[PDB]
Design a protein around this ligand. Sequence first.
Ligand SMILES: [Co+2]
Ligand SMILES: [Co+2]
Length: 218
Amino acid sequence: PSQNAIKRFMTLFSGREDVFSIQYEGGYRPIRRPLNFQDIKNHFSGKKTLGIYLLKKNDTVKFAAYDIDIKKHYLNREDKFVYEENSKKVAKRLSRELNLENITHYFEFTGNRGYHIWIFFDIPVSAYKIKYIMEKILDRIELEEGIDVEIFPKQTSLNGGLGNLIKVPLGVHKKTGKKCLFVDNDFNVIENQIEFLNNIKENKATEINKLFREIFNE
DNA sequence: CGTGCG
DNA sequence: CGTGCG
Ligand SMILES: [Co+2]
Ligand SMILES: [Co+2]
């Protein structure tokens, strides 16, 4: 991947400035130094899979994500594929309401058992405003059986910690060995992932701020 | 590992 | 409180 592609990835998925994490066999662990270009290349090649601490040190985030998963209890069933489709359904319902609010967002298959819905901002926004917005919008949709949705950021203040992390796309899931790629509104894998990454549109912080004031003051 | 969520 | 999840 070009230097430009790496610079664009590091700009969209920009979280804690001086700590990241990588997936090991027993889970994720913090790497206590800034993310560098070689780390991205190790992610893109499948050698080391990255996870990003969304919460920056001033309790702001530059991106956010819904995490839509099939419950692990349902993976053993012969109708497992019904719950894959149900997870697409939940994703489509979130996507429509997000678009009603003019929150531009993007789909990614996670490499395991669900989808991320990625939301990017032009400059970082206060974590509690976007967590509040995402929870309100999520409460508006109907969940399908066997499907769980989590929101990142999982917290809105660090209180001296790191917060929770999210696996970022264009790598491999270390538990399955499967790539995690962007998909289109039909959930088909996109052929040119880098060019899709360049065309990703960031929402405006001033817009997010207004939308929070409107919903909060109801 | 850090810490949320049942 | 135990311990999955990223
Ligand atoms: Co997930
Ligand atoms: Co999840």
